[PDB]
Amino acid sequence: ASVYAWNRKRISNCVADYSVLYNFAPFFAFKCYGVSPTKLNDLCFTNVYA
Amino acid sequence: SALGKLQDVVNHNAQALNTLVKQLSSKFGAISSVLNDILSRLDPPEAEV
């Protein structure tokens, strides 16, 4: 979608593995606030929006 | 209230300890008050600050 029509989504009830990302692309911009990406896979969350 | 003085001494000491224990919950600006979360969800370089 375009910038003024961003595509909100909710993602719950799942065993979420954040290492499927790394097979995607060179990832020009990838920076996390409040949590380090390396120690992400272990932690649990309330509600994950994308 | 004949024994006001002794009772007052006891209450002052108790209240001081209470405020000292309660103040552990305040965050003082950190992202969280408990050390475990800070040390769990963050790399060491940022966990320092």
Short mmCIF file of N, CA, C and O in Angstrom, two decimals, chain B:
data_model
loop_
_atom_site.label_atom_id
_atom_site.label_comp_id
_atom_site.label_asym_id
_atom_site.label_seq_id
_atom_site.Cartn_x
_atom_site.Cartn_y
_atom_site.Cartn_z
N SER B 1 -4.21 8.33 74.97
CA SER B 1 -2.91 8.63 74.37
C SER B 1 -1.89 9.01 75.43
O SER B 1 -1.19 10.02 75.32
N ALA B 2 -1.82 8.22 76.50
CA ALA B 2 -0.84 8.49 77.54
C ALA B 2 0.57 8.11 77.10
O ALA B 2 1.53 8.79 77.46
N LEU B 3 0.70 7.07 76.28
CA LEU B 3 1.99 6.59 75.79
C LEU B 3 2.31 7.11 74.41
O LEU B 3 2.88 6.40 73.59
N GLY B 4 1.91 8.34 74.12
CA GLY B 4 2.13 8.88 72.80
C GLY B 4 3.58 8.88 72.36
O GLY B 4 3.88 8.62 71.20
N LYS B 5 4.50 9.16 73.27
CA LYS B 5 5.90 9.29 72.88
C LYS B 5 6.51 7.99 72.40
O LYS B 5 7.13 7.94 71.32
N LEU B 6 6.35 6.92 73.16
CA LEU B 6 6.92 5.66 72.73
C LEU B 6 6.27 5.19 71.44
O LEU B 6 6.96 4.71 70.51
N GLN B 7 4.96 5.33 71.34
CA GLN B 7 4.26 4.93 70.13
C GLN B 7 4.75 5.73 68.92
O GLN B 7 4.89 5.19 67.82
N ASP B 8 5.05 7.00 69.12
CA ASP B 8 5.49 7.85 68.03
C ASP B 8 6.86 7.43 67.53
O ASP B 8 7.12 7.44 66.33
N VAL B 9 7.73 7.05 68.45
CA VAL B 9 9.04 6.55 68.03
C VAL B 9 8.89 5.33 67.15
O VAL B 9 9.49 5.22 66.07
N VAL B 10 8.05 4.40 67.58
CA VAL B 10 7.88 3.17 66.81
C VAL B 10 7.35 3.48 65.42
O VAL B 10 7.85 2.96 64.41
N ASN B 11 6.35 4.34 65.33
CA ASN B 11 5.77 4.65 64.03
C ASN B 11 6.73 5.36 63.11
O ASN B 11 6.74 5.10 61.91
N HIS B 12 7.57 6.25 63.62
CA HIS B 12 8.52 6.93 62.75
C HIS B 12 9.49 5.95 62.11
O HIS B 12 9.74 5.99 60.90
N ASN B 13 10.05 5.05 62.91
CA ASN B 13 10.96 4.08 62.31
C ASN B 13 10.26 3.22 61.27
O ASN B 13 10.80 2.98 60.18
N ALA B 14 9.06 2.74 61.59
CA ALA B 14 8.33 1.89 60.64
C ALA B 14 8.03 2.61 59.34
O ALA B 14 8.15 2.03 58.25
N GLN B 15 7.61 3.86 59.42
CA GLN B 15 7.29 4.60 58.21
C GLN B 15 8.52 4.82 57.35
O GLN B 15 8.43 4.76 56.12
N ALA B 16 9.67 5.09 57.97
CA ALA B 16 10.88 5.24 57.18
C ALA B 16 11.21 3.98 56.40
O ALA B 16 11.51 4.03 55.20
N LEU B 17 11.17 2.82 57.06
CA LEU B 17 11.45 1.60 56.31
C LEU B 17 10.43 1.39 55.21
O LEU B 17 10.77 0.88 54.14
N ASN B 18 9.17 1.71 55.47
CA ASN B 18 8.16 1.51 54.43
C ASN B 18 8.45 2.35 53.20
O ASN B 18 8.35 1.86 52.07
N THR B 19 8.78 3.62 53.38
CA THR B 19 9.04 4.40 52.18
C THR B 19 10.28 3.91 51.47
O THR B 19 10.32 3.87 50.23
N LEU B 20 11.28 3.45 52.20
CA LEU B 20 12.45 2.92 51.53
C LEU B 20 12.15 1.69 50.71
O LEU B 20 12.69 1.52 49.62
N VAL B 21 11.31 0.79 51.21
CA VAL B 21 10.98 -0.39 50.42
C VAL B 21 10.08 -0.05 49.26
O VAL B 21 10.19 -0.62 48.17
N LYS B 22 9.18 0.91 49.43
CA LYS B 22 8.28 1.22 48.34
C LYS B 22 9.00 1.86 47.18
O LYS B 22 8.65 1.64 46.03
N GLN B 23 10.02 2.64 47.46
CA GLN B 23 10.72 3.32 46.40
C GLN B 23 11.45 2.42 45.45
O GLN B 23 12.12 2.93 44.57
N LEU B 24 11.46 1.12 45.65
CA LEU B 24 12.11 0.29 44.65
C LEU B 24 11.31 0.18 43.39
O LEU B 24 11.86 -0.21 42.37
N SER B 25 10.01 0.40 43.43
CA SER B 25 9.20 0.26 42.23
C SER B 25 9.34 1.41 41.24
O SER B 25 9.04 1.22 40.07
N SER B 26 9.75 2.60 41.69
CA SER B 26 9.86 3.74 40.79
C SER B 26 10.90 3.47 39.71
O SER B 26 11.90 2.80 39.95
N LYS B 27 10.67 3.99 38.50
CA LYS B 27 11.59 3.77 37.39
C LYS B 27 12.73 4.76 37.23
O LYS B 27 13.71 4.42 36.58
N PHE B 28 12.61 5.98 37.72
CA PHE B 28 13.66 6.98 37.59
C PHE B 28 14.05 7.25 36.16
O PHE B 28 15.15 7.72 35.91
N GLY B 29 13.20 6.99 35.19
CA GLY B 29 13.56 7.22 33.81
C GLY B 29 13.99 6.01 33.01
O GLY B 29 14.04 6.09 31.79
N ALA B 30 14.29 4.89 33.66
CA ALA B 30 14.66 3.71 32.91
C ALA B 30 13.44 3.12 32.24
O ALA B 30 12.30 3.41 32.61
N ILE B 31 13.66 2.29 31.22
CA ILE B 31 12.53 1.71 30.51
C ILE B 31 11.74 0.75 31.37
O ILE B 31 10.60 0.41 31.01
N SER B 32 12.28 0.29 32.49
CA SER B 32 11.54 -0.60 33.36
C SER B 32 12.21 -0.62 34.72
O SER B 32 13.37 -0.26 34.85
N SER B 33 11.46 -1.00 35.73
CA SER B 33 12.00 -0.92 37.07
C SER B 33 12.71 -2.19 37.50
O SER B 33 13.60 -2.12 38.35
N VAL B 34 12.32 -3.34 37.02
CA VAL B 34 12.96 -4.58 37.45
C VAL B 34 14.21 -4.83 36.62
O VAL B 34 14.22 -4.64 35.41
N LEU B 35 15.29 -5.27 37.27
CA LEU B 35 16.56 -5.46 36.57
C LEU B 35 16.47 -6.57 35.55
O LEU B 35 17.20 -6.56 34.56
N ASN B 36 15.64 -7.57 35.81
CA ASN B 36 15.59 -8.74 34.96
C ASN B 36 15.15 -8.38 33.55
O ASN B 36 15.72 -8.88 32.57
N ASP B 37 14.11 -7.58 33.41
CA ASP B 37 13.69 -7.19 32.07
C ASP B 37 14.78 -6.41 31.36
O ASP B 37 15.09 -6.68 30.20
N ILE B 38 15.40 -5.47 32.05
CA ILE B 38 16.45 -4.68 31.43
C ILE B 38 17.53 -5.60 30.90
O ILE B 38 17.99 -5.44 29.77
N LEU B 39 17.93 -6.58 31.68
CA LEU B 39 19.00 -7.48 31.29
C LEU B 39 18.56 -8.57 30.35
O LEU B 39 19.41 -9.24 29.77
N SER B 40 17.26 -8.76 30.16
CA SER B 40 16.76 -9.80 29.28
C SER B 40 16.58 -9.30 27.86
O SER B 40 17.05 -9.92 26.91
N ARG B 41 15.83 -8.22 27.69
CA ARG B 41 15.46 -7.75 26.37
C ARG B 41 16.40 -6.68 25.85
O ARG B 41 15.96 -5.80 25.11
N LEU B 42 17.69 -6.72 26.16
CA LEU B 42 18.55 -5.70 25.60
C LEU B 42 19.99 -6.17 25.57
O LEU B 42 20.40 -6.96 26.42
N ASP B 43 20.73 -5.71 24.57
CA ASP B 43 22.13 -6.07 24.47
C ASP B 43 22.90 -5.35 25.57
O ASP B 43 22.44 -4.34 26.10
N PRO B 44 24.08 -5.83 25.93
CA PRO B 44 24.84 -5.22 27.03
C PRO B 44 25.19 -3.76 26.81
O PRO B 44 25.07 -2.95 27.75
N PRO B 45 25.60 -3.34 25.61
CA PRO B 45 25.96 -1.92 25.44
C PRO B 45 24.85 -0.95 25.79
O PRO B 45 25.14 0.10 26.38
N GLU B 46 23.61 -1.22 25.41
CA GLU B 46 22.52 -0.33 25.77
C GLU B 46 22.02 -0.57 27.18
O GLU B 46 21.59 0.36 27.87
N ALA B 47 22.13 -1.81 27.66
CA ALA B 47 21.75 -2.10 29.03
C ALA B 47 22.59 -1.32 30.02
O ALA B 47 22.11 -1.00 31.10
N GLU B 48 23.82 -0.96 29.66
CA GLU B 48 24.61 -0.15 30.58
C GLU B 48 23.94 1.18 30.89
O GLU B 48 23.78 1.55 32.06
N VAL B 49 23.55 1.91 29.85
CA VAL B 49 22.94 3.20 30.11
C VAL B 49 21.54 3.04 30.65
O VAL B 49 21.03 3.95 31.31
#
